[PDB]
Every structure is written in structure tokens, then in C-alpha cells.
Amino acid sequence: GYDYDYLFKIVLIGDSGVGKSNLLSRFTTDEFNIESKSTIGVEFATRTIEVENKKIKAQIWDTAGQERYRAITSAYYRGAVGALIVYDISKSSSYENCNHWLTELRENADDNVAVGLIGNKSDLAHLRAVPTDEAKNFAMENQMLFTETSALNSDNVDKAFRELIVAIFQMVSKHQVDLSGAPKGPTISLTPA
Amino acid sequence: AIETILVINKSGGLIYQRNFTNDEQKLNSNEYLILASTLHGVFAIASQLTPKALQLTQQTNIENTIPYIPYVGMSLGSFKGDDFFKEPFTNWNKSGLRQLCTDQFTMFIYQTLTGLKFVAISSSVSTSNLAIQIADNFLRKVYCLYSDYVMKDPSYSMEMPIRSNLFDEKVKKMVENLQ
Amino acid sequence: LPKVSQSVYQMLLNEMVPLAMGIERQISRLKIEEHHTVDIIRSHNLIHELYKADEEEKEKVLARLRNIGFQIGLKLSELLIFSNNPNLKFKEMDLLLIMKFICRDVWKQIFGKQIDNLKTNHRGTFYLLDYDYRPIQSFSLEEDAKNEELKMIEPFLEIPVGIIRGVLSSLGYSSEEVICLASFIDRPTDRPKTAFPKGVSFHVQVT
Amino acid sequence: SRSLKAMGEEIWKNKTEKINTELFTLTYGSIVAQLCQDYERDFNKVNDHLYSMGYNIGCRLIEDFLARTALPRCENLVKTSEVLSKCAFKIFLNITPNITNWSHNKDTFSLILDENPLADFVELPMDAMKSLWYSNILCGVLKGSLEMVQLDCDVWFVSDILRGDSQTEIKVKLNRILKDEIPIGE
Amino acid sequence: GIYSFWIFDRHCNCIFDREWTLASNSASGTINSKQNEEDAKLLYGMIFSLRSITQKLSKGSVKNDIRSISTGKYRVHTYCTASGLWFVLLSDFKQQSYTQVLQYIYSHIYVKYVSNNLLSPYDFAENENEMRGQGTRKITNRNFISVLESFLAPMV
Numbered sequence: 077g078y079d080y081d082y083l084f085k086i087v088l089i090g091d092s093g094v095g096k097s098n099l100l101s102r103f104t105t106d107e108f109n110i111e112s113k114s115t116i117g118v119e120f121a122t123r124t125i126e127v128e129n130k131k132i133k134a135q136i137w138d139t140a141g142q143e144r145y146r147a148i149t150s151a152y153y154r155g156a157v158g159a160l161i162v163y164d165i166s167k168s169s170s171y172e173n174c175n176h177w178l179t180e181l182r183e184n185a186d187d188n189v190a191v192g193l194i195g196n197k198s199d200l201a202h203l204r205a206v207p208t209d210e211a212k213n214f215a216m217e218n219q220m221l222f223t224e225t226s227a228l229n230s231d232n233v234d235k236a237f238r239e240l241i242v243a244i245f246q247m248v249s250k251h252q253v254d255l256s257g258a259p260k261g262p263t264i265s266l267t268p269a
Numbered sequence: 270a271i272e273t274i275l276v277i278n279k280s281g282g283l284i285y286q287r288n289f290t291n292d293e294q295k296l297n298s299n300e301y302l303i304l305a306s307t308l309h310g311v312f313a314i315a316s317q318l319t320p321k322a323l324q325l326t327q328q329t330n331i332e333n334t335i336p337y338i339p340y341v342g343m344s345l346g347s348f349k350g351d352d353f354f355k356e357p358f359t360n361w362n363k364s365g366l367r368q369l370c371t372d373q374f375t376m377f378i379y380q381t382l383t384g385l386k387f388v389a390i391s392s393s394v395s396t397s398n399l400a401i402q403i404a405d406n407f408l409r410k411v412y413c414l415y416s417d418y419v420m421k422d423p424s425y426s427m428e429m430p431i432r433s434n435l436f437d438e439k440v441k442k443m444v445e446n447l448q
Numbered sequence: 449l450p451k452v453s454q455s456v457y458q459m460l461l462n463e464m465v466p467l468a469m470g471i472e473r474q475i476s477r478l479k480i481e482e483h484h485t486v487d488i489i490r491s492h493n494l495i496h497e498l499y500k501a502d503e504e505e506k507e508k509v510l511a512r513l514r515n516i517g518f519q520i521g522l523k524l525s526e527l528l529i530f531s532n533n534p535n536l537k538f539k540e541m542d543l544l545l546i547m548k549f550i551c552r553d554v555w556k557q558i559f560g561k562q563i564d565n566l567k568t569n570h571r572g573t574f575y576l577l578d579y580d581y582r583p584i585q586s587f588s589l590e591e592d593a594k595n596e597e598l599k600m601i602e603p604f605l606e607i608p609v610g611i612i613r614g615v616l617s618s619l620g621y622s623s624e625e626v627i628c629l630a631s632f633i634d635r636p637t638d639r640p641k642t643a644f645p646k647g648v649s650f651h652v653q654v655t
Numbered sequence: 656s657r658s659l660k661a662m663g664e665e666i667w668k669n670k671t672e673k674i675n676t677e678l679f680t681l682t683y684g685s686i687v688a689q690l691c692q693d694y695e696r697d698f699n700k701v702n703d704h705l706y707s708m709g710y711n712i713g714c715r716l717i718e719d720f721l722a723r724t725a726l727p728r729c730e731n732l733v734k735t736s737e738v739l740s741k742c743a744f745k746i747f748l749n750i751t752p753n754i755t756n757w758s759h760n761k762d763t764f765s766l767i768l769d770e771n772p773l774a775d776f777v778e779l780p781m782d783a784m785k786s787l788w789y790s791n792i793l794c795g796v797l798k799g800s801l802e803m804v805q806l807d808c809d810v811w812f813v814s815d816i817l818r819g820d821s822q823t824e825i826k827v828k829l830n831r832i833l834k835d836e837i838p839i840g841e
Numbered sequence: 842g843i844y845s846f847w848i849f850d851r852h853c854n855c856i857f858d859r860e861w862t863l864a865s866n867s868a869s870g871t872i873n874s875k876q877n878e879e880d881a882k883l884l885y886g887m888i889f890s891l892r893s894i895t896q897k898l899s900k901g902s903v904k905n906d907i908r909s910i911s912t913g914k915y916r917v918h919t920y921c922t923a924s925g926l927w928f929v930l931l932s933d934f935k936q937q938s939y940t941q942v943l944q945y946i947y948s949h950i951y952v953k954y955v956s957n958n959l960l961s962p963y964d965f966a967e968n969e970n971e972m973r974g975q976g977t978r979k980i981t982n983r984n985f986i987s988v989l990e991s992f993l994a995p996m997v
């Protein structure tokens with residue numbers, strides 16, 4: 077099924093315990109090698125979407141470094157053309173670490189990478205600790221898209237992810253043209269003697 | 270009998286998965302992306318697991334050179350002559366995953382200096398050291414062929430899937446010769 | 449003649465001290481068979497428990513294990529007499545012949561090696577000396593905890609005492625005129641050093 | 656490499672120390688007799704303690720069995736039956752139990768002990784004629800070993816020649832093949 | 842000869858560590874040292890990941906297991922048993938494979954001095970809370986370490 081024209085690499089990075097694993101429960105093909113997070117450091121999900129009549133495959137790398145991954149986690153951003161920074165609006169530490177994560181991405185990831193901001197567990201309004209205004213203001217200064225996601229408020233992260241892939245495709249897509257009455261009959265020799 | 274060849278562009282992710290087994294088709298396209306990305310990650314892990322004894326003292330820059338086989342390739346494009354190279358060449362990935370041994374197949378990995386990765390799975394299980402030389406020579410053969418017919422292609426974005434017609438058939442002929 | 453693997457037999461024979469503690473605790477890890485739950489307690493925990501439970505508890509467990517060894521020896525003696533047919537008489541010609549029979553036959557059949565030399569005071573007690581004592585050749589705790597080793601293998605040394613006591617029974621002298629005690633006082637005198645450092649001595653007295 | 660049976664006689668012939676069967680009978684009989692004596696002859700759940708013994712010893716014995724044979728992990732029960740019929744019993748007790756009574760969907764089966772070296776010559780009393788099994792240790796070892804191969808299976812006794820039935824049977828029904836464990840880090 | 846020796850169990854927990862040094866037999870043998878706890882979990886991650894890759898693309902009806910894994914400098918010799926007990930070994934190339942050596946270790950050191958060593962435990966994850974990689978109850982049997990060092994002394 078090697079029909080997809082382009083293969084984009086996206087990294088789903090965020091603070092430990094934020095709930096990334098539940099965040100990428102939707103935009104997946106829920107099969108294949110499960111877990112493997114603690115083994116090498118990443119778990120893999122894929123999505124297929126058509127943009128401008130061209131199939132695109134997006135590979136999602138939900139890396140995390142607990143105690144062992146110092147250099148490998150850095151190497152895993154070798155050519156990521158997308159990033160999906162995650163924080164929970166429950167504790168200000170996760171939102172505070174977003175600048176540190178963005179610094180690592182822009183220092184190590186691919187040049188002019190399209191990176192966004194996701195606010196997970198927004199249904200729990202009881203223990204909110206980061207307002208939407210501050211998150212949006214932080215997104216404005218750093219050229220990022222921002223949204224808030226929840227289990228009850230699902231189908232928003234899917235649209236944000238498709239929109240991020242569309243933003244990437246408008247940047248790393250070289251323009252092309254669709255390249256798609258021949259003579260018939262018996263010929264006669266005309267080469268010189 | 271190299272039954273499968275796959276290549277990983279520069280940062281994980283699969284761009285070519287032509288296989289030459291008779292009929293297995295057990296793994297769909299989706300799982301092979303996971304396989305390639307896992308191979309890249311395991312390569313990264315293997316880089317950072319050198320024993321302490323060799324980290325501070327290598328003294329082994331004579332064995333990295335790969336002796337050349339006469340006609341491992343076949344029996345060209347930008348190249349010319351009876352073979353792609355007659356001289357012996359050097360190893361680049363002196364601190365990375367190099368093969369995987371299994372009783373039913375043997376995987377060989379050849380990493381370009383730039384970052385291109387070429388993986389060959391062979392059903393054959395050689396003293397487990399000469400086969401490294403055979404695999405490296407064949408994979409540099411395939412890398413030269415890729416540099417000919419995939420890099421000199423106007424309609425091919427960098428580090429994207431290799432949807433070409435000359436490259437795949439020529440590597441098919443090349444692996445057909447080697448058995 | 450039929451045979452059984454020595455490994456499984458030795459594993460069963462070692463599995464009496466965990467029996468001896470577990471059954472005594474039952475008189476005094478949850479798990480299901482098919483519909484009813486049964487408690488299973490790990491074997492190695494019971495040796496620790498037997499080491500550090502009580503003096504009277506330990507005495508009861510040791511007596512029970514001695515009874516097991518007594519039954520083994522009592523049943524085994526008749527078959528050995530039927531098969532090998534030694535030159536012994538019923539009650540007593542001399543104790544030296546009886547102990548020679550035990551050393552030459554019983555330990556050959558139970559363990560894989562003939563028991564080593566034996567002392568003789570010629571009137572009272574006999575000492576049977578065994579080097580490296582097969583059924584505990586792979587028994588250890590720790591590099592440093594060496595003194596604990598001797599004190600916490602001690603219950604395992606009762607089954608051969610029971611075997612000797614039983615073999616003495618059904619051969620004349622009963623289990624009132626015979627007292628037997630095992631100990632670790634033996635040295636590895638000059639033989640090559642094995643896994644276990646200490647030997648075994650069986651101080652058996654009859655009258 | 657070779658068939659399971661051929662591996663069985665090859666290992667049994669010249670790759671194992673041996674001990675007389677009669678001594679094994681005496682030792683196990685002494686164990687069961689002392690259990691009967693000290694537990695007030697309440698035969699209802701003396702069997703449970705023998706089962707616990709079997710579990711405990713089998714958990715160690717599986718290590719020896721796999722170290723000797725070095726077989727791959729068993730996936731389906733058609734192959735597990737072959738294994739524990741034609742090599743596992745052969746190495747230890749030198750017997751070859753037969754396999755019959757394949758349940759539907761290949762879920763369960765039964766081991767028929769043509770000879771039981773654990774109970775070679777025993778005559779139970781009338782009290783134990785329909786209360787005691789006397790070979791519970793064997794099924795205890797079977798499951799204690801099979802647990803360590805990552806597959807759970809309830810095993811029990813259907814009949815025994817000692818009690819007076821035609822043949823001794825051991826149903827070894829499965830419950831679930833529990834999956835391997837993976838590390839977790841959060 | 843060799844560089845280091847590792848033993849894992851069914852419970853994804855490293856059970857034994859032995860690190861070697863320059864070819865002197867009495868090397869810096871830090872046994873079960875906390876300083877190598879970091880570079881054991883990722884080794885287990887390597888072995889588990891490549892084992893999963895091997896099983897996924899396997900064919901036939903045997904469910905093959907990985908034999909050895911060679912990097913540029915060293916190579917890994919691995920032996921996995923049905924009971925879930927992996928014997929890994931880091932070593933320079935020098936020779937084809939260590940399958941006989943690892944089998945001998947399993948069948949004459951571990952099985953003899955741990956499984957048949959009722960004093961010591963088995964399945965070292967006890968009563969939950971360390972069954973899944975988070976724990977340390979590594980073996981410190983006198984006979985195991987002594988005999989193992991004696992056996993690997995010639996090869997180094």
C-alpha cells in the first residue's frame with residue numbers, strides 16, 4: 077500500500093504525566109506494536125490524509141525522557157517537520173516547561189518547523205491553573221497554533237492535527253505539473269551508405 | 270539470498286520496501302514503517318552502549334577497512350567499467366548497529382556518512398565476519414545505484430518515498446545476480 | 449531394573465524442611481484450584497521462618513522431620529536386607545558390622561557416594577564422618593553471612609539422622625537405647641574444596 | 656533438530672544420573688504417610704498440601720527441564736501435549752503417558768498413566784477408598800511448571816487406579832495464556 | 842574475550858551484573874553495582890525491541906529467537922529460555938558465537954546454584970510492586986559468583 081506521496085515526521089512531546097498517551101488515542105490506526113515506550117523511548121502512530129489531491133502519510137513520534145534518554149531523545153528530532161507540544165491545564169509546571177521544550181525543538185529539530193500547542197484535560201475545570209489568555213499570548217510570540225482538548229470535547233484535536241499537516245504541506249511541497257499522435261507505419265532506411 | 274531490502278532516509282521513516290521473496294506478503298506497508306523507525310531508534314540506543322574499556326582506548330583503526338570482493342555485484346549509469354569499484358573502502362558507522370543474527374534470517378545495516386541507511390535481510394544464516402564484507406559491498410553497490418537513479422531525478426523531493434521505475438528494477442536485477 | 453532421575457529425587461528429598469515447617473504451621477499467596485481458594489507459601493520463606501520462629505516450634509519441627517527420616521529408614525531396611533542380604537544377625541553380634549553395613553549399602557543407595565571413614569571407641573559411641581554431603585552441595589546465603597549459614601542449614605541435617613535411627617530399628621535395637629546427633633564440627637581436612645565449606649558428622653550412641 | 660521422542664530417549668540414555676524407583680516410592684510414601692498421621696487423617700484437604708508441594712517443586716523443576724532440553728516456548732496445546740507426553744515425563748520418571756479425550760476446540764485433554772511410579776505398590780484403607788488421590792503431587796508439578804512457561808491451566812485428577820477406577824487420568828484444562836510483561840515508566 | 846555479563850528474568854528486572862576491564866583476570870569486577878543500573882534497562886530495551894522485531898517478521902512455525910547482535914565495536918551474545926530468563930554477554934568478536942558457553946552457564950551454574958538453592962529465592966519480584974522493571978533484588982549467592990568468576994576467568 078505504498079501510495080502515499082509524502083512522509084512527514086511529527087513529534088508529540090510534552091511533560092511526563094501530562095496525558096500524551098490518551099491524547100493520541102484518536103488519530104491512530106489502533107493496531108501494531110503496542111507499548112515499546114519504555115524500551116526505546118517512542119511509540120508510533122500513523123495517519124493518512126489527502127491534501128490538494130495528494131496522499132500524505134504522517135508519522136507521530138511520542139518521545140519521552142524519564143531517566144535514561146539524554147542523547148537519544150535529542151537524536152529523535154533529527155528531521156521532524158512537525159511538533160505537537162502538549163501541556164495540561166491543571167498544574168502550571170507543565171505549561172512552564174513549554175518554553176524549554178520549544179527551545180529544544182527549535183535548537184535541534186528541522187529548520188522552520190511547524191509546531192503547535194495542545195491543552196489536554198480541559199474537561200476538568202475544577203483544578204484549572206493556566207488560563208486560555210496566557211496560553212494564547214505565549215503562542216502569539218512564538219508562531220504557534222493553540223487549542224484545548226478533552227475526552228468530552230473530542231474531534232477538536234483531529235481538526236487541529238489535520239490543520240497542522242496542511243500548514244506543513246504548504247511549506248515543504250515543491251510545485252509540480254501533471255505530466256501525463258505518435259507516428260505509425262512502416263519506415264524506410266535513409267542512413268547514408 | 271537477500272530476500273528484502275529497505276532504506277531509511279535520514280531521520281527514521283521508510284522510503285523504499287521492495288522485497289524479492291516468492292510469496293509471503295505477511296507484513297502490510299504500515300508495519301514496515303514501524304520496523305524502520307524502531308531500527309533507527311535501536312541504532313541510537315546501540316551507539317550509547319559501548320563498554321567502558323573501549324571508550325577511552327580504541328587502537329583499532331586498521332580493521333575498519335572493508336576488503337573488496339571482485340564481482341559481487343552482477344554477472345551502468347554515471348559509473349563506467351565492469352564494476353562500481355575495485356578498491357577497498359572504509360567503514361563509517363564504527364559505533365552503531367551493524368547486523369542482527371537470527372537462526373532464520375540475518376539483517377545487515379550499512380549507514381552512509383550523510384545519514385542514509387540501507388538494510389538488507391537475507392534468509393541465509395561464512396564465518397559471520399566475511400558475510401559482513403559481502404553485505405557491505407552489496408549495500409554500497411545499492412547505494413551507488415541509488416545515488417545514480419534517485420538523486421538525479423527532478424521529480425523527487427528529498428527524504429521522501431522513492432517512487433521511481435529505473436532504480437527498483439535495477440536493484441532487482443542486482444539482487445537477482447547475487448544468490 | 450527400573451530407574452528414576454536423581455535430580456527430581458534429590459529435589460523431593462530436600463523438600464522436607466519446608467514441609468516440616470508448613471504442616472506444623474497449618475496445624476497451629478492466595479490461589480484457586482478450580483473453585484476454592486488455597487493458600488500457598490513459598491518454600492524459601494519457610495526456611496527463614498524455621499530459623500527465626502521459636503525454640504519449641506523448632507523442636508517440634510525437628511522431631512517431625514526425624515520421624516519422616518525414621519519411616520524412610522525403617523521401610524528401606526527390609527528391602528536392602530532382601531536384596532543385598534548382609535551377614536548380620538538379629539540383635540547384636542557387634543555394632544561394627546551393623547555400622548559397616550549401613551555405610552556400605554544404605555548411603556550407596558540413598559546418596560551417590562559411599563560415606564567416608566568412621567571412628568570407633570569400641571565400647572560406646574560411633575562417629576560417621578561424611579565429606580561434602582551431597583543434598584546441600586548448592587546451599588548458600590551471602591558472601592558475608594557465613595555464620596548464619598551453619599545455623600540455618602541445621603534442620604536439613606535431621607533426615608539422615610532419622611534414616612540411621614530407622615535402620616538401627618528393625619535390626620535389633622529400638623529407638624530408646626539409641627541416641628544420634630548430627631553436627632557441622634567436621635573440617636575439610638585435605639580433600640579438594642567443594643561448594644559447601646563444612647562437612648557432616650553423625651554422632652550415634654547405642655547401649 | 657530432531658523429534659521430541661528421539662530427544663527423549665537420547666537424553667534419558669546417557670545424559671542423566673539415576674536412582675532406584677523403589678527408593679522414590681519409599682520416600683514419597685513416607686511423606687504421604689506422615690502427612691496422614693499428623694493431620695488427623697482428615698483426607699479432604701491433605702490433598703491441598705500435596706498440591707502445594709507439587710507447585711513448589713515444579714517451579715524449580717521447570718528450570719532443570721528447560722536447561723536440559725532447551726526447547727522453545729510452547730504456544731499451542733497440541734505441541735505442549737507432545738512435549739509433556741514424550742520428553743518431560745521421560746526425562747524424570749521414565750514413563751510415556753498417553754493422550755486421549757481431546758475436548759472441543761482443542762481446549763483440554765487428559766494424561767493416562769499406564770504406570771505410576773509414585774504409587775507403584777500401595778493399598779489405601781477403606782477410609783481413603785474414595786477421599787484420597789495419593790498422586791496429587793504430580794498434577795501440582797505439572798501446573799507449577801506450566802505457570803513458569805507463561806500459560807495458566809487448571810489441572811486435577813479424574814480417576815485413579817488406586818481408588819479402584821479403570822485407569823488413572825489427569826485433565827489439564829487451560830484457563831488463559833497470560834501475555835509477557837513490558838516495562839512501564841511514567 | 843568478554844566485557845560484561847547480564848541476567849534478566851521474566852519480570853523485566855535485571856538480576857545480575859558483572860563488568861570487566863583490561864585483560865587481567867582480577868579486573869574491576871563491580872558486581873551488582875548501582876552505577877550500571879542506568880546502562881542495563883536500555884540494554885534490556887534493545888534486546889526486547891529487536892526480539893519483537895524478529896518475532897513480528899518471522900515465518901514458519903517455530904517463533905525464532907535472536908542469537909547475536911553486533912555493533913561496530915563490540916557484539917552482543919544473547920540466549921533466551923522458555924522460562925523468561927535472558928543471558929546477555931558483551932564481547933569483542935574473536936570467534937563465531939557463545940551459544941555453547943551461555944548454555945553451559947545456564948545448565949551448570951544458574952540451574953545448580955540458584956534454582957536448586959532453596960535458601961535463595963526464585964522469581965525475585967516478590968508480592969507485586971516490582972514485577973515490572975522497578976526493583977533490585979539481585980543474586981548474591983557465594984557459590985554462584987565464585988563458580989561464575991572461575992568459569993569466565995580463562996575467557997577475557
Ligand SMILES: *C(=O)CCCCCCCCCCCCCCC
Pocket residue numbers: 456713716717720726727728729735738739743744747748792793796797800801804923
Ligand atoms: C512448553 O515448554 C511446555 C513444557 C512442558 C511442561 C514441563 C513439565 C515438567 C514436569 C513433568 C513432571 C515430572 C515428574 C514430577 C513428579 C515428582
